[PDB]
């Protein structure tokens, strides 16, 4: 069994590199963030442009959705995070506290908290309703590349250029685990039992974090420079999805670690990929020489 992702739509509009693409939890929309200091909303099934959301002073590195698909959070080079209302396209709150570029962001499953990672080497926890910083973790000794809440929002996994992956207890802020090349990306598996981490040695690793053991190694793609998003594709077959510095989207069989598909269409590094929550749909976004988002669909 191999997927059969076919190109369906190209979403053009951004004037600079696209940095992140995310599908809304309700499966209706796609949000994109860009180096052009803009956020664009698009139809998840048709690629139809919906809205442009502006406010950030410098380029946006990440964007994330609240659980109810009504809010977005963005991480910008202006050292801030902005909570937006997706309906109005208006900035509700501006999260101030980080001393350098905010690189990554995420809401918790409840969507009452926001986790953020920055070049200031820290991980911050914010309250959505008040826009206040609740906890400032001295998480790492190099820029924080990724931050993610687990299934119940009880754990935060962070990664950094220091070469470490840290698992943190949300309410206490304590470090529960440090997993021992720069770590460019990290996230929990949908069940929260595993973590998928990318390193800048062209490698993806599936870890059982509590046991502190790497279970699977995924390679064949190019990744030595960029913090490329990787995903678990679960709607059909079980795949690992990731962009690559060779302008392809890579798809691996989760069990065999074999490459099953390489999606060709982008003219620059594929910085971000997202998997639709209910359909076999992949969104891919590329850098400066491309600036487009592509939507691909499959049987499995």
């Amino acid at each position: 069994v191999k997927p059969n992702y076919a190109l369906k739509f190209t979403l053009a509009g951004h004037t600079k590199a696209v940095s992140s693409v995310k599908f809304s939890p309700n499966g209706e929309w796609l949000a994109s963030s860009s180096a052009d200091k803009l956020i664009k909303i698009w139809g998840a099934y048709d690629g139809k442009f919906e809205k442009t959301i502006s406010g950030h002073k410098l380029g946006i590195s990440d964007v994330a959705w609240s659980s109810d698909s009504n809010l977005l959070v963005s991480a910008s080079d202006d050292k801030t995070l902005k909570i937006w209302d997706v309906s109005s396209g208006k900035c509700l709150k501006t999260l101030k506290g980080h001393s350098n570029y905010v690189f990554c962001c995420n809401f918790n499953p409840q969507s009452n908290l926001i986790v953020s990672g920055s070049f200031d080497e820290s991980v911050r926890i914010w309250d959505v309703k008040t826009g206040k910083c609740l906890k400032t973790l001295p998480a790492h000794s190099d820029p924080v590349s990724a931050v993610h809440f687990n299934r119940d929002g009880s754990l935060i996994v962070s990664s950094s250029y220091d070469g470490l992956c840290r698992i943190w207890d949300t309410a206490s802020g304590q470090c529960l685990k440090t997993l021992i090349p720069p770590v460019s990306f990290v996230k929990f598996s949908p069940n929260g039992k595993y973590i998928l981490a990318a390193t800048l040695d062209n490698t993806l690793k599936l870890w059982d974090y509590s046991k502190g053991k790497c279970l699977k190694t995924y390679t064949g793609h190019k990744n030595e420079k960029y913090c490329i998003f990787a995903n678990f594709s679960v709607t059909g077959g079980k795949w690992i999805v990731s962009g690559s510095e060779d302008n392809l989207v890579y798809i691996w069989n989760l069990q065999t670690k074999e490459i099953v598909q390489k999606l060709q269409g982008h003219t620059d590094v594929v910085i971000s990929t997202a998997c639709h929550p209910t359909e076999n749909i992949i969104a891919s976004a590329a850098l400066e020489n491309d600036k487009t988002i592509k939507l691909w669909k499959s049987d499995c």
Binding site: S19, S61, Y161
Partner: peptide, 9 residues
Amino acid sequence: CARSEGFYT
């Protein structure tokens, strides 16, 4: 934009 730039040799 930090993500689209990359970094350190």
